[PDB]
Amino acid sequence: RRTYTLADYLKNTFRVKSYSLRWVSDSEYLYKQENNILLFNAEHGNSSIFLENSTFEIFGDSISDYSVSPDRLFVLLEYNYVKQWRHSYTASYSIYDLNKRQLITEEKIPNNTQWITWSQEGHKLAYVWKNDIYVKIEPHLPSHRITSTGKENVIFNGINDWVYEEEIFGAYSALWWSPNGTFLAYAQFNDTGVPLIEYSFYSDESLQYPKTVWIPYPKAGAVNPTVKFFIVNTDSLSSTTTTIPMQITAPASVTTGDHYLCDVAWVSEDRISLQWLRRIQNYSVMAICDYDKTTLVWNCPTTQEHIETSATGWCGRFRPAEPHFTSDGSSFYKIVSDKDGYKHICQFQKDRKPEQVCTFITKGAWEVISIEALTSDYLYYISNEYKEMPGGRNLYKIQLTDHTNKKCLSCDLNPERCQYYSVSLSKEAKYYQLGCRGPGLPLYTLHRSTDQKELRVLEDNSALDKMLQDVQMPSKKLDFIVLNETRFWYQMILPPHFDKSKKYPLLIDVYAGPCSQKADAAFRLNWATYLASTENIIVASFDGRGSGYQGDKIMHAINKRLGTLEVEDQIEAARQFLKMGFVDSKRVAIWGWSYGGYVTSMVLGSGSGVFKCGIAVAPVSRWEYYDSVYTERYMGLPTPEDNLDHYRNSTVMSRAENFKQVEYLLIHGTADDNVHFQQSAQISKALVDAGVDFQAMWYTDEDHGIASSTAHQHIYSHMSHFLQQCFSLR
């Protein structure tokens, strides 16, 4: 009869387990068990020790992570990890010789590395340090400098600058070892003309004068960083002092004005696939380039250009989808919007074809989330086709030769507990692990590709199950409402003994940004749980216009004009929830983080009178303040020649007046490098000039995540009390 305390959430009392493995071959994988790396044989439980409780404790308690070379002859030991942005970070490393049974101590690697990675085959290493690329053909051998143009916050070799790291590649890495590890391709960014943002850092109270941090950051419409792509022949290194990398120049239909490097993908060792994007992501080109043995140069013939375009809005969900090539690299499959606006799979030939470059393998009013594997005869993927639940995730597979032999591999399994699946296939797809994140407690099982015989159960959260028994967990409803004749899904977290006759306070959780999805069938133990289990508050989210994986008609609905429909629909959703009955019209709130904090703010400021209070954490207050890549992708350029007007008609501070009818809570990280603070400072200011009172809270030296332990606990406790005050509880 115990409720789910805020402490339960904050102190993470009820642990949710998982099985994160690392396929080492087509039939064996690695697993961390009690700080011991084990090798499992998919087929039989056959296990074995790969690395002991030991080895790790030499560098003691600072072993951040490990990386096993693909020949399993060496292991990378990361330690002295230090964050820097979402994915960037610097560590120190040591190579462990599995055979010689000891730590390699000769040609060590720089005690401040920015990035490192094995090749795809041998024990070849490529790392970035002081912004330059270095290579080591063998763990024992000396380093070979590849670039020397590297310079802090100016020239990036093999790693992304701030914006690319966040908005394009999703990671720090800008390296790509070719198969058979001959070449090593990398990108190089010049931030030279990109403006700087400078926020203060305070550090220990012992620091008398506070430091200052600058970052080349391009806000909407400002000068963007430039790019160049190179491929260097790794095999020569031993016979020279310097090697001259060969450069690939982007395709002409892109080199006329600003543009970007979407994605890099090696096809075969003499073929590589690069995707480019215009600054206005209205257009994109994916060139295929071949290596010329004779002239030792890479060619990217317009004949193999391949163009992707969008008259509705922009390309891809957040960028063109990655291509998947066949062994002989003759054809490739890629996810693109079909004639009806539904992201599906279709075949392409290396060469382009006049208005026929595709042939879809998938049709329907649902979308393919991601291609997972390409066999000689099969294509494994993941879609939300099942039960017409766009909020669901299932693993399908199609026989290449017969586009009819399309069978779902996870639909059946456990329909009661699982509707949201994660996958992971062995090197050549002989086995495949399943990640049930589905409605019920996550269930990790492993199967044999051949006939789908579930070999065994890797992890059933039985333990967690046994613990939640003695606790009043709330429920989660996942349905859809319908407006202007269209399904719009939503999800509600209903408190324990939910009684449809009573009235409960409502809280909307928001994101609502382009291609966002808050209404899905995944299991989660978060703040909303405490809010429902113990405060008896209903937490709901609603995926409205401009969103999810329900087709472009819906997603692009927002194109060129954010702060419009996605906001309104968030309001209607509350209207609808009230019409459902069980909601106390006089106690409805709304909060959001990032984009959500925006909408939250934009909603509280609409004067709809539907909401009583809200909370915005590190919200964007006006699109000019946000980074270019993201912003422009939907908003265009903030210029009278383009879309300036819409940038201006969607300012949070312009709706200041209307904030008198609301209790508002604004929160922001003092060291937010993503959503600058300027954003909130600009908001507060506005409200103050309007004579509107509100509540604020800043978090000294916190990221855009306010994720430090102490701060994490602090901010939620605070928001809780804010809701308590607002809802007349506490």
Q: What angle do CA 315, 317, 320 make, to 5 degrees?
A: 50
Catalog residues that contact a second copy under the rule CB under 8 A. Answer: 195-200, 202, 205, 208-210, 212, 219-220, 222, 621-622, 624-625, 651, 653, 670, 676, 678, 681-682, 684-686, 688-689, 691, 693, 695-701, 710-711, 713-714, 717-718, 721
Task: Confirm whether 569 is a catalytic residue.
Answer: no
Q: Exactly one of 424, 594, 621, 680 is catalytic; name it.
A: 594
**Active-site residue among 672, 676, 703, 720?**
672
Element (H, E) at 567: helix 565-579
Q: Does 546 bind ligand XIH (CB under 6 A)?
A: no
Q: Give least dist CB 165 to a second copy, A.
A: 20
Number of residues that bind ligand XIH (CB under 6 A): 14
Interacting span for ligand XIH (CB under 6 A) from 87-95, 339-347, 454-462, 591-599: 591-599
Q: Which of 596, 605, 638, 669 binds ligand XIH (CB under 6 A)?
A: 596
Is residue 328 flagged as an active site residue?
A: no
Residue 694 main-chain phi, psi, to 5 deg? -155, 180
Site for ligand XIH in 627-656 (CB under 6 A): 630
* Minimum CB distance to a second copy smaller for 220 or for 434: 220
Q: How many other β-carbons are positioned within 10 Å of the β-carbon of residue 236?
A: 12
Q: Which of 541, 594, 651, 720 is in the footprint of ligand XIH by CB under 6 A?
A: 594
Which residues lie closer than 8 Å to 355 by C-beta, 6 or more apart? none
Which residues 6+ apart lie within 8 Å of 548 measured at CB?
390, 391, 489, 515, 516, 517, 519, 554, 555
- Single out the residue of 78, 167, 322, 372 in contact with ligand XIH (rule: CB under 6 A): 167
Q: Look-up: residue for tokens 């001259």?
A: 244
Verify binding: residue 620, ligand XIH, rule CB under 6 A: yes
Separation of alpha carbons 544 and 567, rounded Å: 9
Q: Is residue 703 near ligand XIH by the rule CB under 6 A?
A: no
d(CA 348, CA 357): 6
The stretch among 30-38, 375-383, 389-397, 589-597 that binds ligand XIH (CB under 6 A) is 589-597
Pick 225 or 495: Cβ nearer ligand XIH: 225
18 carries an active-site annotation: no
> Residue from 4, 593, 625, 647 that binds ligand XIH (CB under 6 A)?
593
DSSP secondary structure string for all residues of 139-176: TTSPPEE-----BTTTEEESB--HHIIIIISSSSB-EE
With CA atoms as reference, report the closest residue to 213 among 710, 543, 541, 676.
Answer: 676
In the complex with ligand XIH, the residue whose CB is nearer, 270 or 520, is 520
Quote the least distance from Cβ 273 to ligand XIH, whole Å. 23
Query: How many angstroms separate the Cα of 404 from the Cα of each of 60, 408, 449, 694?
Result: 55, 12, 19, 60
Look at residue 66 and give the partner it binds from a second copy, ligand XIH, none, a contact being a CB closer than 5 to 8 Å depending on partner kind: none
Q: Which residue has the tokens 């969008």?
A: 310
| Residue with Cβ nearer a second copy (180 or 682) | 682
Q: Does 674 bind ligand XIH (CB under 6 A)?
A: yes
Q: Which of 573, 565, 593 is nearest to 506 (CA)?
A: 573
Residue 81, token pair as written in the block: 């990890």
Q: Which is nearer to ligand XIH, 562 or 574 (CB)?
A: 562
CA distance 368 to 344: 5
Residues that are catalytic? 594, 672, 704
Binding residues for ligand XIH (CB under 6 A): 166-167, 511, 513, 592-596, 620, 626, 630, 674-675
